[PDB]
Coordinates of C-alpha atoms and ligand atoms in Angstrom, one line a residue:
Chain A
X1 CA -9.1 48.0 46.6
X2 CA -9.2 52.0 46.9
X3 CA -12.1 53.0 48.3
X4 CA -13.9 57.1 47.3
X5 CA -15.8 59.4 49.1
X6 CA -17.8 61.9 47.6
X7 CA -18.1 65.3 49.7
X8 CA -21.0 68.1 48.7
X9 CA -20.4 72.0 49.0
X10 CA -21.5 73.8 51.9
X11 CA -24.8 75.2 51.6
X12 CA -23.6 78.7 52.7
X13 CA -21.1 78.5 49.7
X14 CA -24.1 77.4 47.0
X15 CA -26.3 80.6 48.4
X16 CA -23.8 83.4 48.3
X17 CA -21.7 84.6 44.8
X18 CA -19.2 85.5 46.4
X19 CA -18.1 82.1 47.8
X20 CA -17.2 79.0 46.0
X21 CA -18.6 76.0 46.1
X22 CA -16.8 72.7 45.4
X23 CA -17.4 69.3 45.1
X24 CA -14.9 66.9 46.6
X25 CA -13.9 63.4 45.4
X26 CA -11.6 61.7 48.1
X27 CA -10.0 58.5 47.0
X28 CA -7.8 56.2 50.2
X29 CA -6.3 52.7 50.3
X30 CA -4.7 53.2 46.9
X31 CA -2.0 50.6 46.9
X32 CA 2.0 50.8 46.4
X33 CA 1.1 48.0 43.3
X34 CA -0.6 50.7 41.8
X35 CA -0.8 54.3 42.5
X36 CA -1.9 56.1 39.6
X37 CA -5.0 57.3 39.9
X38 CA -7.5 58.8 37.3
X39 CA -10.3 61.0 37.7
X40 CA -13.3 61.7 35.4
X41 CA -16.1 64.4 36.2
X42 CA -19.5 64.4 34.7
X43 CA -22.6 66.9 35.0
X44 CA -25.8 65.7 34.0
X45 CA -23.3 62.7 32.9
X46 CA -22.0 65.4 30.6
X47 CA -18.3 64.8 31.2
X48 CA -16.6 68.3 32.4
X49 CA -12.9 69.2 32.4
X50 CA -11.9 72.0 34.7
X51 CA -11.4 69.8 38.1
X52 CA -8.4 69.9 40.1
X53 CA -7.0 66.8 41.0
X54 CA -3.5 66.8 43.5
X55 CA -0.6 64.7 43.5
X56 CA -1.0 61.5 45.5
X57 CA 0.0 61.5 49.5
X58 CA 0.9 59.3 51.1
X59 CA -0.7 58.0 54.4
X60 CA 1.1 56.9 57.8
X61 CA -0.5 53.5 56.6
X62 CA 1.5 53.2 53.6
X63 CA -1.6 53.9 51.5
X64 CA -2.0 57.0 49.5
X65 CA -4.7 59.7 49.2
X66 CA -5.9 61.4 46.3
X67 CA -8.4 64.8 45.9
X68 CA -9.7 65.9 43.3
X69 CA -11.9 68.8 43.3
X70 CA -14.3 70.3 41.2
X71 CA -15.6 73.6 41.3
X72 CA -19.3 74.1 40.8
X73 CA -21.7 76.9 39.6
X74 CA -24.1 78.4 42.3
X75 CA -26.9 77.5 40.0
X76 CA -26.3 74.7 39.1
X77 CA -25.8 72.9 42.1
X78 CA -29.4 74.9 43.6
X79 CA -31.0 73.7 39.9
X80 CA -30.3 69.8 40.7
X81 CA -27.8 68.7 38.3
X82 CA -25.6 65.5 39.9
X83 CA -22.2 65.8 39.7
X84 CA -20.4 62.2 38.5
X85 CA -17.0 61.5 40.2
X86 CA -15.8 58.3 38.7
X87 CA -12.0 57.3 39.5
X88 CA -10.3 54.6 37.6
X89 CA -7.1 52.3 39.4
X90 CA -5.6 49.0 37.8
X91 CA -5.8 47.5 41.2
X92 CA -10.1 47.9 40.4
X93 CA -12.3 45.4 39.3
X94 CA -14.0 48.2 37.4
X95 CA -14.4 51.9 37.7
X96 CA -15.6 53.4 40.6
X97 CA -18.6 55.6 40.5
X98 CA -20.1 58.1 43.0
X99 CA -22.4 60.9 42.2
X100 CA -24.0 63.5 44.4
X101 CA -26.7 66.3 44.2
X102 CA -28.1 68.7 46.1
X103 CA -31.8 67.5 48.2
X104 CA -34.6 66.9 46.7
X105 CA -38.4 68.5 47.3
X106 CA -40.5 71.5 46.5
X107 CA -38.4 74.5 48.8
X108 CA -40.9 76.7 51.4
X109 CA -39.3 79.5 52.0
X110 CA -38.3 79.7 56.1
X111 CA -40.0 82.6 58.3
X112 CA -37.7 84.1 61.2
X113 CA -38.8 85.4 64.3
X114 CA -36.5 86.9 67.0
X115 CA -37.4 86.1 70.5
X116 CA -36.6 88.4 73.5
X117 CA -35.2 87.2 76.6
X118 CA -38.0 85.5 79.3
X119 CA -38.1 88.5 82.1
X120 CA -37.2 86.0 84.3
X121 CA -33.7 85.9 82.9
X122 CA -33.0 89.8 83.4
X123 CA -31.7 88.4 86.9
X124 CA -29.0 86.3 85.4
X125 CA -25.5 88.0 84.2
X126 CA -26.2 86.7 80.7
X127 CA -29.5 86.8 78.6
X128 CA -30.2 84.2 75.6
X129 CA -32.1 86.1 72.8
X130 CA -33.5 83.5 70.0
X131 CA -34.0 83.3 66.6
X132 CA -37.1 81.0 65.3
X133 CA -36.4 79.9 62.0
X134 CA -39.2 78.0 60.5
X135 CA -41.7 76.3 58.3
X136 CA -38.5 75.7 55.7
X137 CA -37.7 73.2 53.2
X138 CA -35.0 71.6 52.2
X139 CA -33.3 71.2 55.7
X140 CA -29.8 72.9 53.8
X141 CA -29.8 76.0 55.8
X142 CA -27.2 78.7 57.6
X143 CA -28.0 80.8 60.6
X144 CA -25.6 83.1 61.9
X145 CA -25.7 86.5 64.6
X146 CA -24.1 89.7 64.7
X147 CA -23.7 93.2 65.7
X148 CA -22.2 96.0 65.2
X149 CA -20.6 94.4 62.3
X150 CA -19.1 91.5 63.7
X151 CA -19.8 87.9 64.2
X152 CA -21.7 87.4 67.4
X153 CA -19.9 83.6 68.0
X154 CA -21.2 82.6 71.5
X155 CA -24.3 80.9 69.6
X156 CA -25.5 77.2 69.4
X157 CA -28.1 76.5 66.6
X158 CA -30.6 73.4 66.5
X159 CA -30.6 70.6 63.8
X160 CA -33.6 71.2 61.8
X161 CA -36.4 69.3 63.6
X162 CA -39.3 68.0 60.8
X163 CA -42.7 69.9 61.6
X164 CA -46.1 68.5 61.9
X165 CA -46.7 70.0 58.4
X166 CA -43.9 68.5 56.7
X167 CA -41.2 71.6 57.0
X168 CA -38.5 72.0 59.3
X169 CA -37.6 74.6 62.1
X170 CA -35.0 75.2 64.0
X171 CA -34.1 77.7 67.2
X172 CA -30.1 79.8 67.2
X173 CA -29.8 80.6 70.7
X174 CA -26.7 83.7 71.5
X175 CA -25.8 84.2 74.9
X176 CA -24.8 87.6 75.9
X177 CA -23.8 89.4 78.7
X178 CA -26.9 91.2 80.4
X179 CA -25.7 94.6 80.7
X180 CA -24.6 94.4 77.1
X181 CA -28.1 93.6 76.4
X182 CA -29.6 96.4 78.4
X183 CA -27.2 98.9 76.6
X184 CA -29.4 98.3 74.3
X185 CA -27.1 96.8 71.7
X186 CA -29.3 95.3 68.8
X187 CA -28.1 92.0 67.8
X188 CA -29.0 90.3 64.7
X189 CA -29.9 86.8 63.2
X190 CA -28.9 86.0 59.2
X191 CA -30.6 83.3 57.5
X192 CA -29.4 81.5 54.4
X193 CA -31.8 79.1 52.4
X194 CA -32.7 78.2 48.8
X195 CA -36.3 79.3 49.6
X196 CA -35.5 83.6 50.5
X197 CA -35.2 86.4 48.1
X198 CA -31.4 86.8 47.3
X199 CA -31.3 83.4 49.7
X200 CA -30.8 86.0 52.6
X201 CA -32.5 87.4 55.5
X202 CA -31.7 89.3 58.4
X203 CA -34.6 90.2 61.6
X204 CA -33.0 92.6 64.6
X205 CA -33.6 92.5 68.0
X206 CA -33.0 95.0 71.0
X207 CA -34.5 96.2 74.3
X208 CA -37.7 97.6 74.3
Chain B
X1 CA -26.2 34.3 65.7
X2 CA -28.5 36.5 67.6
X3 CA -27.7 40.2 68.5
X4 CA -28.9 41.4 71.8
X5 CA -29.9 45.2 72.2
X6 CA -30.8 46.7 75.6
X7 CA -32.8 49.7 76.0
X8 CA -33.6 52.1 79.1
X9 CA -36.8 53.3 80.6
X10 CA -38.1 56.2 79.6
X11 CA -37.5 59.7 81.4
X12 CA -40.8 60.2 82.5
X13 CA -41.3 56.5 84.1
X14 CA -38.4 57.1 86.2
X15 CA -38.7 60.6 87.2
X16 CA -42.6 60.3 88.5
X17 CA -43.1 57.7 91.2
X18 CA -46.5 56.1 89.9
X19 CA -45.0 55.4 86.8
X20 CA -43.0 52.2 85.8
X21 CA -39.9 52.3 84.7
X22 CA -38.2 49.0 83.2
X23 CA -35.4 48.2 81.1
X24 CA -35.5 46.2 78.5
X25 CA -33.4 43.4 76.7
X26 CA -34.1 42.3 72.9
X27 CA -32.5 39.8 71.4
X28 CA -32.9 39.0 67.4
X29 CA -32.1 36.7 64.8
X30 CA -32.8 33.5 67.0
X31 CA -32.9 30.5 64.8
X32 CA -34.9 27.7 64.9
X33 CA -32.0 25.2 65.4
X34 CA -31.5 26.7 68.5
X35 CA -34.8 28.6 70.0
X36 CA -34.4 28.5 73.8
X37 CA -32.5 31.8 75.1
X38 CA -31.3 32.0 78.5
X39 CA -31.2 35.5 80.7
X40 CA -29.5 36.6 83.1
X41 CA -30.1 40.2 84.6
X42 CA -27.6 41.6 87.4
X43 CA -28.0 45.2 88.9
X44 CA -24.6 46.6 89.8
X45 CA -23.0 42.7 89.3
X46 CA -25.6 41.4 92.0
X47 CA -28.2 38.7 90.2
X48 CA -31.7 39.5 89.8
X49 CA -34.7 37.0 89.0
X50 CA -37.8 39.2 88.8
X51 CA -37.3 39.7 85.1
X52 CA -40.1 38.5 82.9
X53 CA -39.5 36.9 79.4
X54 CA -41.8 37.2 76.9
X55 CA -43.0 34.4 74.3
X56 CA -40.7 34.8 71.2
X57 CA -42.1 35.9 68.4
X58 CA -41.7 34.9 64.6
X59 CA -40.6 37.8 62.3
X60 CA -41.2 37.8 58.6
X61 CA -37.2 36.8 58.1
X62 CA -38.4 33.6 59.6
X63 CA -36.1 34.5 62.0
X64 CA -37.2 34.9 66.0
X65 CA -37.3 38.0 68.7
X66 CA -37.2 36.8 72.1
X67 CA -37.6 40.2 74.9
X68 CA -37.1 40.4 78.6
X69 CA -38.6 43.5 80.7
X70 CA -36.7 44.2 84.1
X71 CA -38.5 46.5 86.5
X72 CA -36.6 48.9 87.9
X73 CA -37.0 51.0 91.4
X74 CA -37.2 54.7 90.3
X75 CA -34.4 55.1 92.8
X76 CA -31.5 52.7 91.3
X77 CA -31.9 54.0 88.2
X78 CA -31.6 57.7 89.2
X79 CA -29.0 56.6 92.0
X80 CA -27.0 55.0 88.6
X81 CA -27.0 51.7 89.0
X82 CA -26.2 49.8 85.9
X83 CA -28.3 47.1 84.7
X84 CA -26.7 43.7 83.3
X85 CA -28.9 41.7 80.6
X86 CA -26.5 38.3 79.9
X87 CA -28.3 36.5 76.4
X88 CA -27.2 32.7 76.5
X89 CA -27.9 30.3 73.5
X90 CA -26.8 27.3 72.0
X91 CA -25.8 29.4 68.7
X92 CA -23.8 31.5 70.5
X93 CA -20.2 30.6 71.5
X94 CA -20.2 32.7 74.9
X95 CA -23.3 34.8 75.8
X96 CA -23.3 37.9 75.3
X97 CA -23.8 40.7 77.9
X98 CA -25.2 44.1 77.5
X99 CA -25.2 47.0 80.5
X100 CA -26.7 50.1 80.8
X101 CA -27.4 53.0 83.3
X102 CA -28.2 56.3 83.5
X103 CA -26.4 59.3 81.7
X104 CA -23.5 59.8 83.9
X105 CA -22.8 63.5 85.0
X106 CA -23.2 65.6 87.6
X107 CA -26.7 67.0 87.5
X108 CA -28.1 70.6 86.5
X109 CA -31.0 72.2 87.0
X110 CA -33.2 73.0 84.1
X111 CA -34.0 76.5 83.6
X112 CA -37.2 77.1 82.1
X113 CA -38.5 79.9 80.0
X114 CA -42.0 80.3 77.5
X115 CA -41.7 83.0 75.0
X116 CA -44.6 84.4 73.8
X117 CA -45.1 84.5 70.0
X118 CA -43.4 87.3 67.7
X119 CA -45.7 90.1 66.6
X120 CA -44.5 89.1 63.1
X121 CA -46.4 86.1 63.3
X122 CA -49.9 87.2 64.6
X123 CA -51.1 87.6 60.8
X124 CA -51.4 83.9 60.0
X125 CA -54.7 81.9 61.9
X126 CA -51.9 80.1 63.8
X127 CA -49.2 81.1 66.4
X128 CA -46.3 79.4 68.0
X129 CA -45.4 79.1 71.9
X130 CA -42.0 78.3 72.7
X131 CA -40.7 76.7 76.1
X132 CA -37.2 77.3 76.5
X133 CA -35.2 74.8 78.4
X134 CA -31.6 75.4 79.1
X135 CA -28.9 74.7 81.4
X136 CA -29.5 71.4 81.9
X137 CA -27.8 68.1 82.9
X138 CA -27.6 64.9 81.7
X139 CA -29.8 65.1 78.4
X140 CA -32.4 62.7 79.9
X141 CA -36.1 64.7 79.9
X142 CA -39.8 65.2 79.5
X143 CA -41.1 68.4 77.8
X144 CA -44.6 68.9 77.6
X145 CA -47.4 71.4 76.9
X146 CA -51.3 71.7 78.1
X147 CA -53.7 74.1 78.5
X148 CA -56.7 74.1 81.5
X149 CA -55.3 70.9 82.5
X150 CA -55.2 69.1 79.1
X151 CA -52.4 68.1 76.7
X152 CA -52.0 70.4 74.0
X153 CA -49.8 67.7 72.0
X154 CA -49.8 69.5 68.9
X155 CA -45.9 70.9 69.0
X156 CA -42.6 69.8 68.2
X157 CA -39.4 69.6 70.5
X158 CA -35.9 69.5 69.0
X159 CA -33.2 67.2 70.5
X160 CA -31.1 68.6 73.4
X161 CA -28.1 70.7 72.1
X162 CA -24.8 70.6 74.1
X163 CA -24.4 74.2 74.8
X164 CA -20.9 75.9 75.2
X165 CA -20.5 75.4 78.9
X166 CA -21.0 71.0 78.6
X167 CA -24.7 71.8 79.3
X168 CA -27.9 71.1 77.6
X169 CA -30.7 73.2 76.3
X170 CA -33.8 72.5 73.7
X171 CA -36.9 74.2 72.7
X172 CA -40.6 73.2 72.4
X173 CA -42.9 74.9 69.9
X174 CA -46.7 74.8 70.2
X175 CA -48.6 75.6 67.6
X176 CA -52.2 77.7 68.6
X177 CA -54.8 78.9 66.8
X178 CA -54.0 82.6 66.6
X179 CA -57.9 83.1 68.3
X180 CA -57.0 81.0 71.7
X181 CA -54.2 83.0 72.2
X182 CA -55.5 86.0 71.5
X183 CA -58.5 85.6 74.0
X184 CA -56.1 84.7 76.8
X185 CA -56.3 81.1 77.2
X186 CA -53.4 79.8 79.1
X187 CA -50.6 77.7 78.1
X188 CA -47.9 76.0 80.2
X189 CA -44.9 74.4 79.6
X190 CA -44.0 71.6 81.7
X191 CA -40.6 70.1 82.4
X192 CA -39.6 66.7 84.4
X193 CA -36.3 66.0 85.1
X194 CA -33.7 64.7 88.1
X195 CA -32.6 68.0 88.8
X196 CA -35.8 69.6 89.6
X197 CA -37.4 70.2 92.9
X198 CA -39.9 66.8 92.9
X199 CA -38.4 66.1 89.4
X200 CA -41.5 68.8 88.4
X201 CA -41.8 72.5 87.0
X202 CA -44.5 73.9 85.5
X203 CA -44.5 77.7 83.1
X204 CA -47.3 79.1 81.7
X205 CA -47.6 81.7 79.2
X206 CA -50.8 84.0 77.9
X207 CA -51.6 87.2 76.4
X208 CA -51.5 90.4 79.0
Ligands
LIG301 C1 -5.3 54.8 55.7 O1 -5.4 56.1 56.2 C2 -6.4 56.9 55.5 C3 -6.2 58.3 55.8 O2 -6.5 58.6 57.2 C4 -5.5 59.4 57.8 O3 -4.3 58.8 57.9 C5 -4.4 57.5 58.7 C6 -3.0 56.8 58.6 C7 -4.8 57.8 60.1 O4 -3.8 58.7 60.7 C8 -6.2 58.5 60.1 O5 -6.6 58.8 61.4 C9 -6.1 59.8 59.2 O6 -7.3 60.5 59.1 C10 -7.7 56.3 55.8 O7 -8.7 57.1 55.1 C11 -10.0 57.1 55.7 O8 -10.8 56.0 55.2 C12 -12.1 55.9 55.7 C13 -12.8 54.7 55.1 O9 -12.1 53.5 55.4 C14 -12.9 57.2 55.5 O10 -14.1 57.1 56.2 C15 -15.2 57.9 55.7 O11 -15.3 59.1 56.3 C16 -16.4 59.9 55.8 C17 -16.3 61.3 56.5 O12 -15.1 61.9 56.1 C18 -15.1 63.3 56.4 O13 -15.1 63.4 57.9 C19 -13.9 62.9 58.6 C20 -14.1 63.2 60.1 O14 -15.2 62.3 60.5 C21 -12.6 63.5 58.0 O15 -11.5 62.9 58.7 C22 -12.5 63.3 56.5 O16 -11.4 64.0 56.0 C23 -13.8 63.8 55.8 O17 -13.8 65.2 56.1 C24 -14.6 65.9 55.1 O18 -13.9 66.1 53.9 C25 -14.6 66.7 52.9 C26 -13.7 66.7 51.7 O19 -12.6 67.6 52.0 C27 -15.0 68.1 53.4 O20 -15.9 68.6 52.4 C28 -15.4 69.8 51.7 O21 -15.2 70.9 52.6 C29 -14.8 72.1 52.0 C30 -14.5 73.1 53.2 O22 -13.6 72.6 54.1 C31 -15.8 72.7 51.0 O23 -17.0 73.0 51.7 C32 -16.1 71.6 50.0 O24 -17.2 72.1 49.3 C33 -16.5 70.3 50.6 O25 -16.6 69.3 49.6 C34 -15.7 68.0 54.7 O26 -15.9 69.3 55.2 C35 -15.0 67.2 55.7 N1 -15.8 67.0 56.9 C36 -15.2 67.0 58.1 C37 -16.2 66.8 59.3 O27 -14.0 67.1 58.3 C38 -17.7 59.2 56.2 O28 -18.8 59.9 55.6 C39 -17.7 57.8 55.6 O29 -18.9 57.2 56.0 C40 -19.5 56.5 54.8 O30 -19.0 55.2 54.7 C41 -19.0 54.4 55.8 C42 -18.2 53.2 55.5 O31 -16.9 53.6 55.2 C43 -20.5 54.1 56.2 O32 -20.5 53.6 57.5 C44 -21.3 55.4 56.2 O33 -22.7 55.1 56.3 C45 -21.0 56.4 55.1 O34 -21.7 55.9 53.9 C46 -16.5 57.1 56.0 O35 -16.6 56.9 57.4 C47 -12.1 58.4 56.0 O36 -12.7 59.7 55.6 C48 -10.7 58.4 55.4 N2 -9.9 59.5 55.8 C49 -9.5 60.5 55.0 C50 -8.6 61.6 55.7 O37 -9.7 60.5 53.8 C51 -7.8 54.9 55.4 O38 -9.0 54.2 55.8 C52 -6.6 54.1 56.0 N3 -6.6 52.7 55.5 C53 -6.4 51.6 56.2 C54 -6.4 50.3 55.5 O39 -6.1 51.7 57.4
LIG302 C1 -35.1 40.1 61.2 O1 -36.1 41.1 61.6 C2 -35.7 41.7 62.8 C3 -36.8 42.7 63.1 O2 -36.9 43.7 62.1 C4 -38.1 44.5 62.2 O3 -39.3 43.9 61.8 C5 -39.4 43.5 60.4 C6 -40.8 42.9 60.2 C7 -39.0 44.6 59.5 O4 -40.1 45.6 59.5 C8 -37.7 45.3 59.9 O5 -37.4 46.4 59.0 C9 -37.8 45.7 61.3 O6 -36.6 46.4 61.7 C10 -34.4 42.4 62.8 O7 -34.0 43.0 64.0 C11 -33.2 44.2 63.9 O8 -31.8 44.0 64.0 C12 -31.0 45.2 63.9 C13 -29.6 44.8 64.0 O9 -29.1 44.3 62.8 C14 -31.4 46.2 65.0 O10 -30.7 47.4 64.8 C15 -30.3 48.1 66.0 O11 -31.3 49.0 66.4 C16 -31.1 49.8 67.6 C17 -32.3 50.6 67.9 O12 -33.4 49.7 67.8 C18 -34.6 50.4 68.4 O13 -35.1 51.3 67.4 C19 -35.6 50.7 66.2 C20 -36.3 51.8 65.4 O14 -35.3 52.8 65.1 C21 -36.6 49.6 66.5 O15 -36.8 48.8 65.3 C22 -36.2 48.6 67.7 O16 -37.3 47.8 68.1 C23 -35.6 49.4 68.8 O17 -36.8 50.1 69.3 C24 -36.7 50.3 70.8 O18 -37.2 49.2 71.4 C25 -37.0 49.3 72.9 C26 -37.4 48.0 73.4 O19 -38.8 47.8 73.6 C27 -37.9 50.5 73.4 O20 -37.5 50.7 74.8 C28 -38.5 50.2 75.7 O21 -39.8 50.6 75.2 C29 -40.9 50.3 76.1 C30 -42.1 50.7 75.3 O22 -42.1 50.0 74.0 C31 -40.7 51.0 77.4 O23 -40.5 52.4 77.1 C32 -39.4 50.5 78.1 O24 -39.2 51.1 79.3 C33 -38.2 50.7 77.1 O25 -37.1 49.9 77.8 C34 -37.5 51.8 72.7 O26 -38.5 52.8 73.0 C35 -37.4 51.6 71.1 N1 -36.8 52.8 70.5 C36 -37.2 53.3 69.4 C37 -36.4 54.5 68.9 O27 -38.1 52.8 68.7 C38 -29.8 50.6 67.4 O28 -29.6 51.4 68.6 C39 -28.6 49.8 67.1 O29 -27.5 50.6 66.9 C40 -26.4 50.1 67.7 O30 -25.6 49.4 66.9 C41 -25.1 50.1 65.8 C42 -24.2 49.1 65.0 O31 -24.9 47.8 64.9 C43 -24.4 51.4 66.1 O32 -24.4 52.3 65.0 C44 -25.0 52.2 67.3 O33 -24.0 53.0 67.9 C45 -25.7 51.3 68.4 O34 -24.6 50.8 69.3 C46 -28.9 48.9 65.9 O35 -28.9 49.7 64.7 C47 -32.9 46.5 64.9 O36 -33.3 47.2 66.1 C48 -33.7 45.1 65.0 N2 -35.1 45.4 64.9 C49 -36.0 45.0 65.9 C50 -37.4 45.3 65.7 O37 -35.6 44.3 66.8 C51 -33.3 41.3 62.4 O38 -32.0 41.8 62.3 C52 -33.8 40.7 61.0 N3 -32.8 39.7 60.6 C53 -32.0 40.0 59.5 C54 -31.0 38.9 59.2 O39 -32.0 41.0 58.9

């Protein structure tokens, strides 16, 4: 039988209007037999129509692979609804049914705190500035550095690590070249979470 | 039948000399038709017979939970020798054997950095302390904070992150009332691992 696998949006794409959040239902191992495959989408197991399903494709294992996706409003997605995917195939007992929704729990909005390089790091080539990001809640989060208007990419970010208190932090370390640092370039750490005015901050950080 | 899982000492036992390190074989779902478990324990294919066997132990599946302990010497662990643990019993059509050894790699040392809290936060009654710990290789390591002497165990320490050069770094965040800090107690950071000088570094941290 065909299996499904139901994929959530990014949380980046649920916090900003100007991207688009989707949710993806994946269908694999649909047979030769059989290969039509219907799709039916529910919010709040109100049944919506606008998804986007794709022609079948076919798989080097001689099994085909069907998409469809459905495109999802910011707020509703943040507000909790659960998005329904169920696909229907004669070679099913039954139809299949997934849903999916966004974490649960009361959000705390995170606080972020940029951290200068130790002084015994000055004496390195490169210097790791850090960006705290904590006490926040759900663990759906994005953290991203810049400057002078573009990405900063040489950056590895913590998984959220569960606090004493019941939150979540996390630490974005970006490693940058020492002279660039004393140069006095200011760098900067966005944050994207549920919990922030406009789901957005930004804290700066340069030599002093 | 039984599954067999086979776990290693901890960082700390191995890394300090007057701790004791040992690895450790458990083997589940043992059936009363066929109790009586037979191990054997190898280090680098050579037989061992100092392992000691524990009395099994009923679990509330009615099914048993049978565990060896292996000392180790400090030194064949780090030196990566890999441990056998070979599970016979009558259930079992062959016995089944488990290794393990140390993280392979070629070692790094840790690099280790406090950061004192961000001005930011000194309006709340508590502050955090971070330890930064990067640079490191393999992931295997102790990160702990006291203050005059004493464990300050009140902080959290995310998982190691590979970092873009194949390396490792974490942080460690104290938490502190906002009034110990600000009358100058002293903090320190301390880190155990195989790349260290003694497998020991210490870094404190206080307000000027
Ligand atoms: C026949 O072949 C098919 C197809 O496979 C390909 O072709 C074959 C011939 C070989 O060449 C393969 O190597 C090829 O890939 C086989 O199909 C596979 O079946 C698996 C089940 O049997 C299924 O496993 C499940 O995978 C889930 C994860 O899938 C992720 O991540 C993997 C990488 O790990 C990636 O390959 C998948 O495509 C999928 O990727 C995600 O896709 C979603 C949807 O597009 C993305 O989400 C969207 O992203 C956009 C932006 O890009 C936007 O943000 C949208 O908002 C958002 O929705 C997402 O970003 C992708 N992530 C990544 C990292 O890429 C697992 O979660 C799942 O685990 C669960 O189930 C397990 C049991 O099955 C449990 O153990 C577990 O606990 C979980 O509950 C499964 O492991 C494969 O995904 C599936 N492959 C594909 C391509 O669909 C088929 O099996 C085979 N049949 C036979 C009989 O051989
Ligand atoms: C009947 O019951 C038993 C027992 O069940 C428990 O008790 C009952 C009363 C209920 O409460 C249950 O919910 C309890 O679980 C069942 O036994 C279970 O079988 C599972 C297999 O089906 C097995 O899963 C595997 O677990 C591995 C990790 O186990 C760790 O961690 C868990 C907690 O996360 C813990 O339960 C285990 O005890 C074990 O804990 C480690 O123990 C070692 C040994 O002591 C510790 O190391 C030593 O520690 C001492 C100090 O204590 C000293 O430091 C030594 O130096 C050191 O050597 C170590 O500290 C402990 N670690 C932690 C974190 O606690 C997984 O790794 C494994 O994954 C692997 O396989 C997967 C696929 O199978 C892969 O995904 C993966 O890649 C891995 O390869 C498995 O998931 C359970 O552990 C096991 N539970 C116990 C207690 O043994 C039994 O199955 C059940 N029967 C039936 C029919 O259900």
């Amino acid at each position: 039988g065909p299996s499904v696998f139901l994929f959530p949006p990014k949380p980046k794409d649920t916090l900003m209007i100007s991207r688009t959040p989707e949710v993806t239902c994946v269908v694999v191992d649909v047979s030769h037999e059989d290969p039509e495959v219907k799709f039916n989408w529910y919010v709040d197991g109100v049944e919506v129509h606008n998804a986007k399903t794709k022609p079948r494709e076919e798989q080097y294992n001689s099994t085909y692979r069907v998409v469809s996706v459905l495109t999802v409003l910011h707020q509703d997605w943040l507000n909790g609804k659960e998005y329904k995917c169920k696909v229907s195939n004669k070679a099913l007992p039954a139809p299949i049914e997934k849903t999916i929704s966004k974490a649960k729990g009361q959000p705390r909005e995170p606080q972020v705190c940029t951290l200068p390089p130790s002084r015994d790091e000055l004496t390195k080539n490169q210097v790791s500035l850090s960006c705290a990001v904590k006490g926040f809640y759900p663990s759906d989060i994005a953290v991203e550095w810049e400057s002078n208007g573009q990405p900063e990419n040489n950056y590895k970010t913590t998984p959220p690590v569960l606090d004493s208190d019941g939150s979540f932090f996390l630490v974005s370390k970006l490693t940058v070249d020492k002279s660039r640092w004393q140069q006095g370039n200011v760098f900067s750490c966005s944050v994207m979470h549920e919990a922030l005015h406009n789901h957005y901050t930004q804290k700066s950080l340069s030599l002093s």
